[PDB]
Ligand binder design. Structure first.
Ligand SMILES: CCCCCCCCCCCCCCCCCC(=O)OC[C@H](CO[C@@H]1O[C@H](CO[C@H]2O[C@H](CO)[C@H](O)[C@H](O)[C@H]2O)[C@H](O)[C@H](O)[C@H]1O)OC(=O)CCCCCCCCCCCCCCCCC
Ligand SMILES: CCCCCCCCCCCCCCCCCC(=O)OC[C@H](CO[C@@H]1O[C@H](CO[C@H]2O[C@H](CO)[C@H](O)[C@H](O)[C@H]2O)[C@H](O)[C@H](O)[C@H]1O)OC(=O)CCCCCCCCCCCCCCCCC
Ligand SMILES: CCCCCCCCCCCCCCCC(=O)OC[C@H](CO[C@@H]1O[C@H](CS(=O)(=O)O)[C@@H](O)[C@H](O)[C@H]1O)OC(=O)CCCCCCCCCCCCCCC
Ligand SMILES: CCCCCCCCCCCCCCCC(=O)OC[C@H](CO[C@@H]1O[C@H](CS(=O)(=O)O)[C@@H](O)[C@H](O)[C@H]1O)OC(=O)CCCCCCCCCCCCCCC
Ligand SMILES: CCCCCCCCCCCCCCCCCC(=O)O[C@@H](COC(=O)CCCCCCCCCCCCCCC)COP(=O)(O)OC[C@H](O)CO
Ligand code: SF4
Lengths: 110, 206, 168, 361, 114, 100, 147
């Protein structure tokens, strides 16, 4: 069975997406940043997120594969995404979708 | 750092349509869809009961066409009623993603829009479902009067009637997916059958 | 040379093509459930072929029994025996496969020669439309022994099958 | 009038190969019956939703149309536009075929629904027996919907559905058998023309058996086991999303209007405003070629068929909210332990009464 | 030769009825959202994940209930032409059909006693 | 649509059923092939009844009996297969050989 | 008359501030918003009962104070003007930006007059306010309906 940490704009699984399926593997740790397109992404920001994901899964892991640790990785990835959005590297989508600012409203940095 | 949490500022402006025939057909596409919402029979806690009161004879959502459905495959509306703990958050996202694409969400009660009375000193409640799924309508209040759930249904119908068949592009999932090998010692699942046939149930240890 | 006969020929050849393709699928396909459903396809096509031969009662009877009772039985039993099909190939296979193929082709050629050679007695008189009342007359005048012994046949089949498929 | 005569004659007046005109007319009734079947489905959905609401001191759909008239239209058009899902390891071709095999033979059985004499598609010689044979293909559809799923939830539902649809096929045939004993035949028009001055009054047990067996075709809340939400989620339907699920949602109400019309024609008669109407020689009407009287009696026959079909649709969707469900084993004991013995007893009784008193049988 | 009157309609109506699903299900395919591939494509297990293994614990519960159905399905086929032709037959056919039905009744009793 | 065509079709169905009865390895498929064979026989009977003996149809009653008994023999054969499966736990017809 | 043309958009471009009278079932005015959006105008509905002065929220800035709940002592956010910030983020070929207010019944006549006057200044900015009412979707200029 799968082991996953699924929240908004982060989806970590424990398998390999071959064509759309998941296929639990016990060492792949796929990642699916922002499926619903709450935000608008760039090529540099996605690379930063992938690098953070790698250094978070590789440099700090010798522990079990419980769903607790998967959630613990997803939480750090989402804090990193929120920091990227605060600094302004990315932004909300503004498209005609739901548009509920889940990571905070736009403020003016006083 | 000029404006924190900025907006997109997009390009390629709209590519929307104008001819009377296609907008008149969009009228029917959106009328058939909003006046036959089928909610998923999904309750977790207190608010569900008020939702059930909204099913009862005192005032039923049967008018304006709402028939509660059991499986998410036929449901196109999930009225999240109850506090979502961290134990059950992935059990909701699943039920949401396991459900056809022109779908909607209503976060009812305070415990699904901000965390509610559990937004403080609680270590297990998800502080709002807006950080799990794209909510469409929020109605506040510990258990909201079941004629406030119907007000939320009114505000959701007038949002559904807004959609545009020439705009269903903002409805798929982009799937920016990656991969990274790990070394993390898979453990055996500690949740199986074996409750009464367990050997430790039949005789005390010496 | 007509619109009725043209339809009766086109439908016959369509149903014959359906019979051949579904019957080849029953025996050639690697998956067994596809064969279990193409079998009902065969039975439905043959039920149509009966109607095209002025036999309206026996076609409905076939649809009742073959694609309504025997097919459902075969589907249940095919579900009962699922174990993921770990069939290891056996050496002495091309021998029996080739033998079956050649004996089948030879028997078919022999039967086709026999059918195209013998002078059947066509007896050009239009058949009867009320084909069920006649079958009702033959159950109790001519075919009384078989009609009466089919009951005991069904009873012994029920007894023996319950005994074999019982659980104890 | 004989609209067929006029159509073929006016079409042959401009040539067009008279024999070919008879081929150019089949679509006319073959789609008139489709129209009445679809309207019957809309009526059945509307009646269910508006009668279940009255029974429960409630109000059904009222914000769709004037009286919720457009509620079935909306519920269908929604399911048209819905994204269809096909789960991971499920089969791809038995999936999209189950909901069609459970529907095609339910529509095909409308060949034999009379709606008044000369007002039906090709009164067949097999008639009701052809319907008994065709109603045995839906279990293949349910087994197909269950076998082509990676969900063991729904295979167990497909099996318990295909095992209920075969339990109520022997008594459903033993009731039509007793009706065909009296009817001298099997064609529906020939079955009903024995009512010339109703079979319910001479088959008071076969009527009960037929009606119970027809309600127990995986249709009504008396049973509705594969749809019993609480015990199991939708059974086999739990994985169909768009139009594939609407085919189940639709093939279950057409299978109800069909049964209502069939109980009407077997035990009551799609004719016969109760008095022996055709003995209205008291108005000195030459029915034979009366240009009207023909249309007046046509309308009377259609109304008298629909009254007694609506009676049973009403009574079925009323029992839905009156009779408690039975598990699955109290269900399989109705057939094979109560309905099959009583069906055999009714058949033997009709035989004994037809051999002794050949009049009135 | 073909003398079965009423047929012409069963073929045409069979075609027009088989055309209803393959047309509604194609109209729905033309106008409906595209794919939803990633995790929409899993099996519904009440929100949790499939337990694994995924068998059925085979039971003869539904072979016997199909055996006994086949038996009486054949019985009805044998009884239909007797009932339709009960006029020209009269007596001495009721006796044979009654023997048939009694044998089938003993069959049902045997199936119901185990 | 002639008698020779119906007979050749029945012979070809007989052929296919024989091939499936000898070649197939699963155990229910041989029963399905036997059913194909019995259908090939019923087709002969109905063709002969429709063309040769068309008034007092006697191939059609014989065909009714053939259908009856094919149902019965299937009901018994699936029972035999369930019995052998309950013990050997397979249906591979190339493993029911207790000989040399 | 069961199907509408584009008179709504013309009337909005003429008056500037309309006052809908939608029926209290809320599924028959979204099509008029879709008509607005198809012309080039971009909408944004923000449920009037919940805005402040309507001048600090729409024109000027305003310090939003989130819900500290015992932790995280009082902090302000200063979200930008809800209009001047959305007039800058219009799509390239955008005809304007109309402001939709769902529950307009809660506002007062003073705020209605303010919203009407705000349309003349600040050019690319129209206003629709769903004041509750009639059983058909009728509109009326927002400069009217008051005084
Ligand atoms: C969604 C569900 C509802 C949707 C509606 C269906 C869509 C169609 C909409 C069109 C409606 C307009 C048609 C006007 C109805 C009058 C036509 C008629 O009666 O025509 C009747 C003729 C009669 O046919 C002839 O009828 C003759 C005599 O009548 C016979 O009819 C029966 C057979 O014996 C009776 O037993 C009777 O005694 C017998 O004499 C002979 O049988 C001939 O062989 C036969 O050809 O058939 C025909 O062309 C009829 C063929 C067309 C069928 C349409 C009928 C629709 C039902 C309308 C009922 C109206 C009720 C009252 C309306 C006002 C309100 C109070
Ligand atoms: C070049 C391209 C070409 C492409 C072709 C495609 C284009 C399509 C063309 C236009 C579409 C029109 C579709 C419908 C038109 C109506 C045709 C008609 O009127 O067709 C008339 C037909 C035909 O039957 C009639 O049949 C009699 C004639 O006898 C013969 O008619 C039949 C055919 O032979 C039978 O075989 C009969 O036994 C045979 O003897 C009549 O007198 C007429 O002649 C004959 O037409 O009527 C019947 O079949 C009876 C069925 C209707 C009965 C109505 C009861 C109505 C139900 C009530 C409505 C309300 C329901 C709502 C509530 C429901 C809840 C349950
Ligand atoms: C007088 C009638 C004249 C014509 C009548 C036609 C009626 C049916 C067809 C409607 C016209 C548009 C059809 C195109 C097919 C399609 O869906 O394209 C894909 C686009 C989706 O947009 C697209 O979305 C696509 C992605 S996606 O797959 O949709 O997710 C994306 O690629 C694309 O860019 C985006 O624009 O959708 C459409 O074009 C329309 C789909 C929904 C239209 C429903 C109309 C409802 C009418 C039924 C009610 C009428 C009652 C009876 C009348 C007889
Ligand atoms: C085997 C064959 C079977 C084939 C199957 C058949 C498929 C049929 C598919 C078609 C079904 C469509 C039904 C529509 C019913 C309906 O709309 O509900 C009626 C509702 C009720 O509200 C109304 O609205 C009005 C109020 S208001 O102004 O809207 O607010 C007021 O009238 C009142 O509320 C109420 O009347 O109307 C509406 O709410 C607005 C929706 C607008 C509908 C569009 C008009 C229809 C146009 C068709 C397309 C033609 C294209 C050319 C036109 C230029
Ligand atoms: C349960 C699933 C299905 C199982 C079985 C499926 C198999 C299908 C059944 C096979 C049907 C058999 C063959 C049909 C015979 C056709 C020819 C025929 O029937 O003769 C009739 C006449 O035949 C025809 O005219 C029919 C030919 C047209 C049928 C073609 C199909 C129609 C397709 C739809 C209509 C399309 C029209 C527009 C095309 C441009 C006889 O007329 P009658 O009944 O009145 O008897 C007396 C006769 O009138 C004169 O004495
Ligand atoms: S939202 Fe309020 S009423 Fe509902 S479960 Fe949470 S605390 Fe209880």
């Amino acid at each position: 069975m799968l082991l996953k940490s699924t929240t908004r704009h982060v989806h970590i699984y424990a398998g390999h997406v071959v064509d759309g399926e998941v296929h639990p593997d016990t060492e792949t740790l796929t990642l699916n940043v922002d499926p619903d397109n709450e935000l608008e992404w760039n090529e540099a920001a996605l690379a930063k997120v992938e690098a953070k994901f790698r250094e978070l899964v590789a440099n700090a892991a010798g522990e079990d594969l419980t769903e607790y640790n998967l959630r613990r990785i997803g939480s750090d990835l989402e804090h990193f995404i929120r920091s990227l959005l605060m600094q302004g590297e990315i932004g909300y989508n503004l498209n005609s979708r739901v548009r509920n600012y889940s990571l905070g409203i736009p403020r003016v940095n006083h | 750092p000029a404006i924190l949490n900025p907006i997109a500022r997009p390009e390629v402006p709209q590519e929307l349509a104008e001819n009377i025939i296609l907008t008149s057909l969009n009228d029917v596409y959106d009328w058939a869809r909003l006046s036959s919402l089928w909610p998923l029979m999904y309750g977790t806690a207190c608010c569900f009961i008020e939702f059930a009161a909204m099913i009862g004879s005192r005032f039923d959502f049967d008018r304006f066409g709402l028939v509660p459905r059991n499986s998410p495959r036929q449901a196109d509306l999930i009225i999240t009623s109850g506090t979502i703990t961290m134990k059950m958050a992935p059990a909701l996202v699943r039920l949401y993603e396991q459900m056809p694409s022109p779908k909607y969400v209503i976060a009812m009660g305070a415990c699904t829009i901000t965390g509610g009375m559990f937004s403080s000193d609680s270590y297990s409640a998800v502080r709002g479902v807006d950080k799990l799924i794209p909510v469409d309508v929020y109605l506040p209040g510990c258990p909201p009067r079941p004629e406030a759930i119907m007000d939320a249904i009114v505000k959701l119908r007038k949002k559904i009637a807004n959609e545009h068949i020439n705009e269903r592009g903002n409805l798929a999932q982009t799937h920016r997916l990656f991969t990274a090998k790990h070394k993390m010692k898979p453990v055996p699942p500690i949740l199986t059958g074996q409750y009464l046939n367990a050997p430790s149930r039949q005789a005390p240890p010496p | 040379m007509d619109l009725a006969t043209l339809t009766q020929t086109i439908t016959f050849f369509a149903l014959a093509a359906a019979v051949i393709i579904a019957a080849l699928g029953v025996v050639l396909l690697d998956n067994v459930v596809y064969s279990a459903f193409l079998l009902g396809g065969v039975f439905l096509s043959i039920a149509g072929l009966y109607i095209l031969m002025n036999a309206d009662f026996v076609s409905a009877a076939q649809i009742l029994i073959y694609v309504g009772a025997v097919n459902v039985l075969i589907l249940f039993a095919i579900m009962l025996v699922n174990k993921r099909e770990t069939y290891t190939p056996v050496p002495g296979r091309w021998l029996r496969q080739g033998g079956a193929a050649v004996v089948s082709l030879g028997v078919f050629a022999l039967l086709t020669k026999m059918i195209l050679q013998t002078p059947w007695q066509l007896s050009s008189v239009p058949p009867t439309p009320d084909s069920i009342t006649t079958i009702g007359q033959h159950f109790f005048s001519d075919f009384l022994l078989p009609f009466e012994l089919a009951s005991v046949l069904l009873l012994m089949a029920l007894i023996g099958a319950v005994v074999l498929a019982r659980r104890e | 009038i004989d609209l067929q005569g006029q159509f073929i004659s006016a079409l042959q007046s401009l040539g067009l190969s008279h024999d070919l005109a008879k081929l150019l007319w089949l679509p006319l009734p073959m789609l008139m019956m489709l129209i009445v079947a679809t309207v019957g489905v809309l009526v059945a959905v509307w009646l269910e939703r508006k009668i279940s609401a009255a029974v429960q001191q409630r109000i059904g759909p009222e914000y769709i149309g004037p009286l919720g008239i457009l509620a079935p239209l909306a519920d269908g058009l929604k399911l048209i536009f819905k994204e269809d899902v096909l789960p991971a390891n499920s089969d791809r071709w038995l999936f999209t075929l189950g909901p069609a095999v459970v529907v095609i033979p339910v529509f095909l059985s409308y060949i034999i629904v009379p709606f008044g004499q000369n007002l039906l598609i090709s009164n067949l010689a097999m008639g009701v027996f052809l319907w008994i044979a065709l109603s045995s293909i839906a279990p293949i559809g349910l087994l197909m919907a269950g076998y082509a799923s990676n969900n063991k939830y729904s295979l167990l539902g497909g099996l318990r559905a295909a095992a209920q649809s075969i339990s109520y096929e022997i008594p459903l045939a033993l009731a039509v058998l007793a009706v065909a004993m009296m009817s001298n035949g099997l064609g529906t028009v020939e079955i009903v023309e024995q009512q010339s001055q109703w079979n319910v009054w001479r088959q008071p047990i076969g009527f009960l058996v037929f009606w119970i067996a027809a309600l127990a075709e995986c249709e009504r809340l008396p049973f509705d086991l594969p749809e019993a939400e609480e015990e199991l989620v939708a059974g086999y339907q739990t994985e169909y999303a768009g139009m594939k699920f609407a085919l189940f949602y639709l093939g279950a109400y057409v299978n109800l209007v069909l049964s209502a019309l069939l109980v009407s024609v077997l035990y009551f008669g799609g004719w016969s405003f109760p008095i022996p109407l055709e003995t209205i020689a008291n108005l000195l009407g030459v029915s034979e070629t009366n240009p009207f009287l023909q249309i007046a009696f046509a309308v009377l026959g259609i109304t008298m068929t629909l009254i007694k079909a609506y009676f049973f649709v009403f009574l079925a969707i009323l029992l839905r909210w009156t009779v408690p469900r039975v598990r699955i084993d109290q269900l399989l004991d109705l057939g094979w332990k109560f309905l099959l013995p009583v069906g055999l007893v009714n058949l033997l009784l009709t035989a004994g009464l037809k051999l002794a008193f050949p009049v009135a049988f | 030769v073909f003398v079965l009157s009423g047929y012409e309609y069963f073929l045409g109506f069979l075609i027009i009825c088989s055309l209803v699903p393959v047309l509604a299900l194609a109209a729905s395919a033309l106008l409906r959202p595209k794919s939803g591939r990633m995790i929409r494509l899993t099996t519904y297990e009440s929100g949790m994940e499939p337990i694994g293994g995924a068998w059925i614990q085979f039971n003869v519960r539904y072979y016997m209930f199909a055996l006994v159905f086949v038996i009486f399905d054949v019985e009805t086929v044998f009884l239909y032409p007797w009932a339709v032709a009960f006029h020209q037959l009269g007596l001495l056919a009721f006796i044979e059909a009654l023997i048939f039905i009694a044998i089938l009744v003993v069959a049902l009793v045997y199936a119901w006693r185990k | 649509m002639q008698l020779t065509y119906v007979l050749i079709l029945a012979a070809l169905l007989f052929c296919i059923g024989i091939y499936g009865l000898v070649t197939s390895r699963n155990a229910v498929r041989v029963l399905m092939s036997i059913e194909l064979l019995l259908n090939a026989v019923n087709l002969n009977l109905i063709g002969f009844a429709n063309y040769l003996d068309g008034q007092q149809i006697k191939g059609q009653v014989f065909a009714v009996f053939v259908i009856t008994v094919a149902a019965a023999e299937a009901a018994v054969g699936l029972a035999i297969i369930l019995a052998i499966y309950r013990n050997r736990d397979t249906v591979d017809m190339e493993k029911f050989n207790l000989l040399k | 008359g069961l199907l509408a043309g584009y008179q709504f958009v013309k009337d909005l471009e003429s008056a500037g501030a309309l006052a809908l009278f939608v029926p209290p079932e809320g599924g028959f005015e979204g099509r008029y918003q879709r008509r607005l959006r198809s012309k080039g105008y971009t909408t944004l509905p923000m449920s009037a009962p919940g805005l402040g002065d309507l001048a600090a929220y729409l024109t000027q800035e305003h310090g939003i104070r989130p819900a500290h709940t015992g932790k995280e002592d009082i902090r302000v956010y200063f979200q930008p003007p809800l209009v001047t910030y959305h007039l800058e983020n219009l799509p390239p070929n955008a005809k304007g930006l109309v402001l939709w207010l769902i529950d307009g019944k809660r506002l007062s006549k003073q705020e209605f007059a303010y919203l009407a006057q705000l349309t003349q200044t600040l050019p690319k900015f129209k206003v629709v306010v769903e004041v509750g009412g009639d059983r058909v979707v009728r509109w009326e200029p927002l400069a009217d309906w008051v005084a």
